[PDB]
C-alpha cells in the first residue's frame, strides 16, 4: 500500500512492504478486479461456464461475499469486445465495433441491458481496433469533454470520432500536429495521458532515451512536441514499460519507466510540482496580494492514515478520488 514517508505533513510518499492478504477472493480464473458496478469499489468479476458474478473489494480492506450478475452478455468475452463508457453513465458498457455499426449492451450496474445495434450515419466509418497493426485505436478524452471519444493515431495524423452516446459517433475530425516517420512509428510507442491535467488527453511518443510530448490543444490538434531526455543508461525498448499515474498526489500524472532486465529498475519523471491552471494568485494593486496552494485529497489521507498508525487505529478512506482541495492561502500587505 502507500504510506507517508517521514514526518506527518511531509510531502514524501513511499510504499509499504508487501503483505499477503488475509482475504483472497478465490475464483481467480477468468476474472479481473474492476468497478463493474460503478460504485466506487472494485469488483472481482468472474465469467465463464455458469460463472456470472463477482466479489467486492470494500474500501475498508474487506470483501463482499460472492454476488451473481443479473445478466451477462454472451459476447462479454468475445474477442475484440471493449468495455467503455458509451452511454455516458460513467459505467463501462460492453461493445463490439465494426466500420458502420456498433453493438452495445448498456451497463445497468447490476448487469447489462438488452443490447442494440447502432448504425452510424452518413460516411462515418469507424476505426476498428486491431484492424491495422500500424495504427493505434483507442478510447480517450482527446477533446477534453469529459467523455472518451474514439480515436485513431497514425504516424501522420490523429482522427477522432466524437462520442454522442449510446454508441453513436459523430463526424470524424482531424487533429493535426502529431507526427513521426512512418518507418519509426509503432502504436506500441504511443501513449495517452492528460499530463496537462485540464481535461484533454495529451499524445505521447516514446523513443529510446527520449520522449515526445504533444500537448493537446483542447481537441484542436497538437502542439509541436517537447522532447524530453531520459537519464544516461535509461534506454527504452519493447520489453520496457511506461506507466502514468499521480503517484505524487499532485493531481498530475507522472511518468514511470521500467526496465525489467537485470532486476526491475524504475524511473520517474515529474513535469510539475503543482496542478496547472488552478488559480493561484490574486492582486488588487492596492497593496493586497493573495497566494493559494493546493493538495490532493490523497495526501491528506496519507496523513490521516499515518496518525492512525501512531494511535493504533485502522481508519478507512471512503473517497478513492485524488482531487485537489485548497490547502493553504496567504494574504500579504504590500504596505506594512
Amino acid at each position: 500500500s502507500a504510506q507517508r514517508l517521514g514526518e506527518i505533513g511531509s510531502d514524501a510518499v513511499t510504499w509499504e512492504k508487501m503483505q499477503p492478504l488475509s482475504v483472497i477472493p478465490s475464483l481467480q480464473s477468468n476474472a479481473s478486479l474492476v468497478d463493474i458496478n460503478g460504485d466506487g469499489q472494485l469488483d472481482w468479476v468472474i465469467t465463464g461456464p455458469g460463472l456470472r458474478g463477482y466479489h467486492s473489494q470494500r474500501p475498508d480492506g474487506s470483501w463482499t461475499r460472492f454476488t451473481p450478475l443479473n445478466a451477462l452478455p454472451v459476447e462479454y468475452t468475445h474477442p475484440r469486445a471493449q468495455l467503455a463508457d458509451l452511454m455516458g453513465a460513467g459505467l463501462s458498457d460492453l461493445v463490439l465495433i465494426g466500420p458502420k455499426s456498433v453493438r452495445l449492451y448498456a451497463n445497468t450496474r447490476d448487469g447489462f441491458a438488452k443490447g442494440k445495434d447502432v448504425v452510424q450515419s452518413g460516411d462515418i466509418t469507424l476505426p476498428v481496433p486491431g484492424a491495422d497493426p500500424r495504427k493505434l485505436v483507442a478510447f480517450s478524452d482527446v477533446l477534453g469533454s469529459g467523455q472518451a471519444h474514439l480515436v485513431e493515431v497514425s504516424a501522420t495524423k490523429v482522427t477522432c470520432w466524437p462520442n454522442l452516446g449510446r454508441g453513436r459517433f459523430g463526424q470524424p475530425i482531424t487533429l493535426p500536429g502529431f507526427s513521426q516517420p512512418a518507418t519509426e512509428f509503432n502504436p506500441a510507442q504511443v501513449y495517452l495521458a492528460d499530463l496537462d491535467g485540464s481535461g484533454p488527453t495529451d499524445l505521447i511518443y516514446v523513443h529510446t532515451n527520449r520522449l515526445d510530448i504533444f500537448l493537446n490543444k483542447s481537441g484542436n490538434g497538437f502542439a509541436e512536441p517537447v522532447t524530453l531526455r531520459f537519464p544516461e543508461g535509461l534506454r527504452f525498448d519493447h520489453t520496457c514499460q511506461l506507466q502514468m499515474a499521480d503517484v505524487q498526489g499532485l493531481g498530475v500524472a507522472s511518468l514511470i519507466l521500467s526496465v525489467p532486465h537485470m532486476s526491475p529498475h524504475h524511473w520517474r519523471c515529474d513535469l510539475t510540482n503543482m496542478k496547472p491552471w488552478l488559480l493561484n494568485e490574486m492582486n488588487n494593486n492596492m497593496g493586497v496580494h493573495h497566494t493559494l496552494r493546493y493538495r490532493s485529497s490523497s495526501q491528506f489521507w496519507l496523513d490521516e492514515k499515518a496518525a492512525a498508525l501512531t494511535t493504533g487505529q485502522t481508519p478507512v478512506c471512503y473517497l478513492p478520488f485524488p482531487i485537489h482541495t485548497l490547502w493553504q492561502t496567504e494574504t500579504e500587505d504590500e504596505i506594512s
Binding site: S26, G50, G53, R65
Partner: protein, 241 residues
C-alpha cells in the same frame, strides 16, 4: 471389454463371450481364434451402435435447488443453513435427499455434507424426448464461490452414493480450488479411461458433497471457509443419445 461395451452403450443385456472356447477334449486348440471372433463381433456391434451423441453442458445452482424445494419438503437458504451448521455441529437442514447434515460415519462426524437427487434437478426437462432418450453424465466439475485465506485451499469430496456398475474410483471426485474444479490434476477426455461419474443417468441417483472438518466447535478448517460460501455450483456435462 464386454463390460466396457455394456457400460458405454447403456445396455447390459449385450453378450458376446460364451463358454466352451476351450474344449478339454481338443486341448484348447482354436480357443484363441474362437475368442478373436467374438471380439470382432463385439466391435462390430459397437460401431453400429455408436453415434455422435450431443454434448450438453448444464450448470446447477445448489442454492436454487434447495431454495426451491416444495413447501412440503421444507426449502431453505443454503448459505444460511450452512452457517448455522458450522456453529451447530449436530444440526441439519432440508429433508429426503435434498439436505445438509454432518456425516454419520465416525470419520465423517466433523464433515459437513450436502446432498441432492438427480430426480429433483429434473435436467431431462431441458430437451424433448424425441431428441434422444438416453441421457447420461460425462463429467462433473465443481465451483465454490467463497473466500480463502492467504494460501488456504478448500477441501471437499464429491460423490455418488448409488454406486452400481460405475468403474472403481469413479464414485468420487476431489475438489481443491473450485473454478470448474475436478478430481484430476489434468482433465483429459482422451485419457482412454472413464471419468468420475461417467455413465450415471440423468434422471435418478444421489450426489453429495462433503467438507471435512466443517464443525466449528471442533475448531475444524472448513468451518471458517464455509462461512463465506454463498452457493455451490455444479457444471454437469452430459450427453444425449
Amino acid at each position: 471389454a464386454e463390460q466396457a461395451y455394456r457400460w458405454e452403450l447403456n445396455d447390459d443385456s449385450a453378450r458376446f463371450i460364451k463358454p466352451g472356447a476351450w474344449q478339454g477334449t481338443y486341448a484348447g486348440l482354436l480357443a484363441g481364434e474362437t475368442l478373436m471372433l467374438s471380439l470382432a463381433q463385439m466391435e462390430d456391434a459397437h460401431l453400429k451402435r455408436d453415434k455422435r451423441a450431443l454434448e450438453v453442458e448444464r450448470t446447477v445452482s445448489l442454492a436454487e435447488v434447495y431454495a426451491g424445494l416444495p413447501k412440503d419438503n421444507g426449502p431453505f437458504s443454503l448459505a444460511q443453513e450452512i452457517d448455522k451448521l458450522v456453529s451447530q455441529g449436530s444440526g441439519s437442514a432440508g429433508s429426503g435427499n435434498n439436505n445438509l447434515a454432518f456425516g454419520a460415519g465416525t470419520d465423517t462426524k466433523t464433515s459437513l455434507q450436502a446432498s441432492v437427487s438427480f430426480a429433483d434437478l429434473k435436467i431431462r426437462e431441458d430437451y424433448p424426448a424425441s431428441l434422444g432418450k438416453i441421457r447420461r453424465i460425462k463429467q462433473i466439475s465443481v465451483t465454490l464461490p467463497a473466500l480463502l485465506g492467504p494460501y488456504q485451499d478448500v477441501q471437499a469430496i464429491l460423490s455418488y452414493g448409488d454406486k452400481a456398475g460405475l468403474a472403481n474410483g469413479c464414485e468420487a471426485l476431489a475438489v481443491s480450488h473450485g473454478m470448474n474444479d475436478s478430481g484430476q490434476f489434468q482433465l483429459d477426455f482422451n485419457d482412454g479411461k472413464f471419468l468420475p461419474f461417467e455413465g450415471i443417468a440423468i434422471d435418478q441417483g444421489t450426489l453429495t458433497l462433503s467438507f471435512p472438518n466443517a464443525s466449528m466447535p471442533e475448531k475444524g478448517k472448513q468451518a471458517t471457509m464455509l462461512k463465506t460460501l454463498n452457493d455451490i455450483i455444479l457444471h454437469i456435462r452430459y450427453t444425449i443419445k
